[PDB]
Amino acid sequence: QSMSKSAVSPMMQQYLGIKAQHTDKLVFYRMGDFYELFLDDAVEAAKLLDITLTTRGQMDGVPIKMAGVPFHAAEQYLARLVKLGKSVAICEQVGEPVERKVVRIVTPGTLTDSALLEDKETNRIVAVSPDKKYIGLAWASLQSGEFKTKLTTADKLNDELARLQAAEILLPDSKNAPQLQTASGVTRLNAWQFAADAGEKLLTEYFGCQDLRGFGLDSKEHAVSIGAAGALLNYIRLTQNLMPQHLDGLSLETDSQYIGMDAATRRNLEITQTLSGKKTPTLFSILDGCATHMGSRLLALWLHHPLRNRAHIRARQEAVTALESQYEPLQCHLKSIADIERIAARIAVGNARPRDLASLRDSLFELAQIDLSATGSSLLETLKAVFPETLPVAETLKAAVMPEPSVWLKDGNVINHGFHPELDELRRIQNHGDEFLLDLEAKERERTGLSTLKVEFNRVHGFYIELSKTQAEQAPADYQRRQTLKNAERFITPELKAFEDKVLTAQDQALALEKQLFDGVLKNLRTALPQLQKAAKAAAALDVLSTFSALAKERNFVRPEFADYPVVHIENGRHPVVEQQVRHFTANHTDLDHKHRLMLLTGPNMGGKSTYMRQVALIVLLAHTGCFVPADAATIGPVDQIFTRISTFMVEMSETAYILHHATEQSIVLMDEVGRGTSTFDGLALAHAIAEHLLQKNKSFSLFATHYFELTYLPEAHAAAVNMHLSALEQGRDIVFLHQIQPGPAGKSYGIAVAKLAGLPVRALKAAQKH
């Protein structure tokens, strides 16, 4: 393996220096006004981006493959590449003098740029450190500050992964990495980065605390999850420009905090995504009346993390009732603030640009005006306390940044007038720009008798005066001259050289001064990042609570009550999504307690069994978010998990296996027509057993819909079973469904579909009666 380095250009040789460090990722090498890619990176990017592949120069004889993109559209192409789980290192040149650096690595899970994120996109990076009994989970969202760790098991893993919706996963390079789907981008990390002891040094040093007990860890059992946090914190460090200091606390997630739901249950209920994978009526889209982007994202969070702690739930409920009389002024203020949660993020990772501070400034002022707007008597009063706390940050931004700064700091006109006296003075040499030149042209027109001379400028030559070749002979030896032209001839003069060296120096010192003063206020903002993140969280909380208020007031939701005994009482409740799809939707009751635990639904095929079942689960879910539920009243007992089951057939049996040995007395199980598949022999036998389990060996409140009429006999075999069914009425030779729960099991009226039949249908009426 001998080399050139005469076989390869020094521009290319430098590229290979960078590319060697990022052999797994695409490298956007800045080349002029383009980012270019070389070699296999070129062939890859030319496939992926439908941009033209080409060739530049030679390397060891061989033409070098190349492909590029204009700088003005780089974020756009970057957005595509990360949609396809690709990382890109951005190689720019940096210095005073110049070195080729990587500056920033864009990965699917560390996005903070508004250009690479949808407005309601939650963006998480999760790292799994597997012991083998336990598994350390640690996740973070650079855009929201979130930073949590959890201890979990191997089989309970894909549930946690679906819950977190991670955009990127960090795995060890070890041979005992957990087998898993792929998924989002999966990024493997060289083993020792998940070290618990090194992960503990990193964490304690990042938060500047003694140990990790306050967060509820210590390297006893949690060691594996401490290392996973460590690995996350390192990967953030390797990818981000500045190491962000906005990662809020670091909480241990226990299973007791939220109503657990398996992956399939999240999917089936269509919480944030349909069964065909969209935003075509979901629970989130039907409730998403948030005024802010950060509010919308928070609501997505809440709908997936229904609280178990009934105190926090009431804290939230006290707020929403209080906001009932004052949400229309609130939602006007919030509607005009920008995404300050993301702006705080971009500040933290050294990625914020001049107009972000303008938006942050103006919205923090708009948040300070909510101090009136509303008051109350709850958690709200701690929310209100936050907004004026942040005015000191707004004032300093008002004083340091223009009302409208230029887009790029490099262009100047970012720092405000009067913030720095020197800058104003430096900047003042500008009228002396144009007025000294008008005072000079006129003092040369009469001096030469030519109204065909003006003081011109170009980047290469600087200031000059040009005269035609005819008039070039008319010029004094006071003029200095340089380059020769075709029609004309341009001249320097020492009395504008003195001017040129004054204004161009003033330009450079001003540009340099704005840079240093901007970096100065970023130094300040980054230290004031705690108050900023509190501002973001308070603004978004209030936005969701405001939305909860408006929904209840505008669609008749009621504050559900909580009980200490196993119970689910719902006074004519409704399905919150299907309710805005039907013009008329018929409400229905739901009564269950200790003695009435399993409701066995039987019914025709367009009788609303599924809808009614999903309606119950959705009311229970909503109940524990602090939102009000769609009913006239509701009362729910302590609930721990929600299970559902609504292609086949081992996936039917897989999802029910999980249900059977995880559901408890506090769980709520939903089962829709289990048995479809195989037969009516083995199918009925299984559906018989599964019911013979929810009643006995895990006393769960269950809704069990089924076509197996043979299961009607359960209320006459267990105290807890109940038979209910759904209505079908005769109108005019044509059947209809009023969609109403009715006690009992619907009788047999398929032979009633003689409303258009032909027989010899007695032969049917002779097989049933079947006693």
Ligand X SMILES: Nc1ncnc2c1ncn2[C@@H]1O[C@H](COP(=O)(O)OP(=O)(O)NP(=O)(O)O)[C@@H](O)[C@H]1O
Contact positions toward ligand X, by CB under 6 A?
578, 582, 585-586, 588, 605-612, 646, 672-673, 705, 739
Looking at residues 697 to 716 of the shown chain, list those that interact with a copy of itself (rule: CB under 8 A): 697, 707-710
Binding status of residue 767 toward a copy of itself by CB under 8 A? yes
* Closest of 375, 168, 163 to residue 269, by C-alpha: 163
573 marked as part of a ligand binding site: no
Minimum distance from residue 146 beta carbon to a copy of itself (Å): 33
Minimum distance from residue 761 beta carbon to ligand X (Å): 23
329 marked as part of a ligand binding site: no
* Closest of 456, 486, 457, 455 to residue 472, by C-alpha: 486
Distance, CA of 709 to CA of 750 (rounded, Å): 12
Minimum distance from residue 130 beta carbon to a copy of itself (Å): 21
* Biggest distance spanned by C-alpha atoms of the chain: 125
Distance, CA of 174 to CA of 190 (rounded, Å): 8
Nearer to a copy of itself, 399 or 754 (CB): 754
HSE-CB of 314 using CA atoms within 13 angstroms? 6
Distance, CA of 452 to CA of 289 (rounded, Å): 65
Binds 767: which of a copy of itself, ligand X, none (CB < 5-8 Å by kind): a copy of itself
CA distances for 538 relative to 253, 327, 535, 748, angstroms: 22, 15, 5, 57
Binding status of residue 165 toward a copy of itself by CB under 8 A? no
CA distances for 250 relative to 192, 207, 383, 710, angstroms: 21, 9, 22, 53
605 marked as part of a ligand binding site: yes
Residue 401: phi and psi, rounded to 5, are -115, 140
Nearer to ligand X, 571 or 665 (CB): 571
Say which residues have a Cβ less than 8 Å from residue 492's Cβ, sequence separation at least 6.
Answer: 461, 462, 463, 464, 479, 480, 481, 482
Nearer to a copy of itself, 621 or 690 (CB): 690
CA triplet 663, 665, 671: central angle to 5 degrees?
A: 45
Nearer to a copy of itself, 509 or 740 (CB): 740
Minimum distance from residue 747 beta carbon to ligand X (Å): 16
CA distances for 379 relative to 299, 319, 558, angstroms: 17, 6, 19
Binding status of residue 681 toward a copy of itself by CB under 8 A? yes
The strand pair at 168-171 and 125-130 is best described as parallel
Residue 49: phi and psi, rounded to 5, are -105, 0
Distance, CA of 377 to CA of 375 (rounded, Å): 7
* Closest of 592, 724, 748, 609 to residue 672, by C-alpha: 609
Binding status of residue 605 toward a copy of itself by CB under 8 A? yes
CA distances for 138 relative to 72, 106, 146, 607, 719, angstroms: 36, 20, 10, 45, 45
SS3 671: strand
216 marked as part of a ligand binding site: no
Nearer to a copy of itself, 349 or 746 (CB): 746
Binding status of residue 678 toward a copy of itself by CB under 8 A? yes
Which of residues 330, 552, 631, 686 is near a copy of itself by CB under 8 A? 686
Which of residues 62, 485, 582, 764 is near a copy of itself by CB under 8 A? 764
Binding status of residue 684 toward a copy of itself by CB under 8 A? yes
Binds 98: which of ligand X, a copy of itself, none (CB < 5-8 Å by kind): none
Nearer to a copy of itself, 138 or 746 (CB): 746
607 marked as part of a ligand binding site: yes
Binding status of residue 757 toward a copy of itself by CB under 8 A? yes
Minimum distance from residue 738 beta carbon to ligand X (Å): 8
Which of residues 332, 504, 606, 738 is near a copy of itself by CB under 8 A? 606
Binds 332: which of ligand X, a copy of itself, none (CB < 5-8 Å by kind): none
Nearer to a copy of itself, 404 or 682 (CB): 682
Which of residues 30, 432, 693, 718 is near a copy of itself by CB under 8 A? 693
The strand pair at 125-130 and 134-140 is best described as antiparallel
Nearer to a copy of itself, 460 or 767 (CB): 767
Binding status of residue 746 toward a copy of itself by CB under 8 A? yes
Binding status of residue 238 toward a copy of itself by CB under 8 A? no
Binds 683: which of ligand X, a copy of itself, none (CB < 5-8 Å by kind): a copy of itself
Minimum distance from residue 688 beta carbon to a copy of itself (Å): 4
Minimum distance from residue 646 beta carbon to ligand X (Å): 6
Binds 649: which of a copy of itself, ligand X, none (CB < 5-8 Å by kind): a copy of itself
Nearer to ligand X, 141 or 282 (CB): 282
Residues facing 100 on adjacent strands: 93
732 marked as part of a ligand binding site: no
Binding status of residue 447 toward a copy of itself by CB under 8 A? no
Site string for a copy of itself, 556-595 (x = CB under 8 A): ----------------------------------------
225 marked as part of a ligand binding site: no
241 marked as part of a ligand binding site: no
For a copy of itself, which stretch binds (CB under 8 A), given 254-262, 379-387, 500-508, 689-697? 689-697
Binding status of residue 677 toward a copy of itself by CB under 8 A? yes
Q: For residue 636, which amino acid is it?
A: I
Give the containing element (helix H, strand E) for 547: helix 529-555
CA triplet 369, 371, 372: central angle to 5 degrees?
A: 90
Binding status of residue 39 toward a copy of itself by CB under 8 A? no
Looking at residues 715 to 734 of the shown chain, list those that interact with a copy of itself (rule: CB under 8 A): 734
Looking at residues 613 to 672 of the shown chain, list those that interact with a copy of itself (rule: CB under 8 A): 647-650, 652-654, 656-658, 660-661
Nearer to a copy of itself, 341 or 673 (CB): 673
Do the beta carbons of residue 351 and residue 113 sit within 8 Å?
yes
Minimum distance from residue 256 beta carbon to ligand X (Å): 32
Binding status of residue 742 toward a copy of itself by CB under 8 A? no
Please count the other Cβ atoms lying within 10 Å of the Cβ belonging to residue 320: 26
Binds 758: which of a copy of itself, ligand X, none (CB < 5-8 Å by kind): a copy of itself
Do the beta carbons of residue 568 and residue 668 sit within 8 Å?
yes
Give me the sheet containing 455-458, strands edge to edge. Answer: 455-458, 462-466, 490-491
Binds 754: which of ligand X, a copy of itself, none (CB < 5-8 Å by kind): a copy of itself
Nearer to a copy of itself, 626 or 683 (CB): 683
Binding status of residue 736 toward a copy of itself by CB under 8 A? no
Q: Give the pair of three-digit tokens for residue 69.
A: 């993109």
Nearer to a copy of itself, 133 or 770 (CB): 770
Distance, CA of 499 to CA of 506 (rounded, Å): 10
SS (H, E, C) 87-149: CEEEEEEEECCEEEEEEEEECCCCCCCCCCCCCCCCCCEEEEEECCCEEEEEEECCCCCCEEE
SS3 541: helix
Distance, CA of 519 to CA of 425 (rounded, Å): 20
Nearer to ligand X, 273 or 615 (CB): 615
Minimum distance from residue 287 beta carbon to ligand X (Å): 19
Nearer to a copy of itself, 382 or 680 (CB): 680
Distance, CA of 677 to CA of 687 (rounded, Å): 12
SS3 444: helix
Distance, CA of 561 to CA of 318 (rounded, Å): 12
Binding-site residue set for ATP: 603-610
Binding-site residue set: 603-610
Residues making contact with a copy of itself (CB under 8 A): 602, 604-606, 647-650, 652-654, 656-658, 660-661, 676-686, 688-690, 692-693, 697, 707-710, 734-735, 746, 748-768, 770
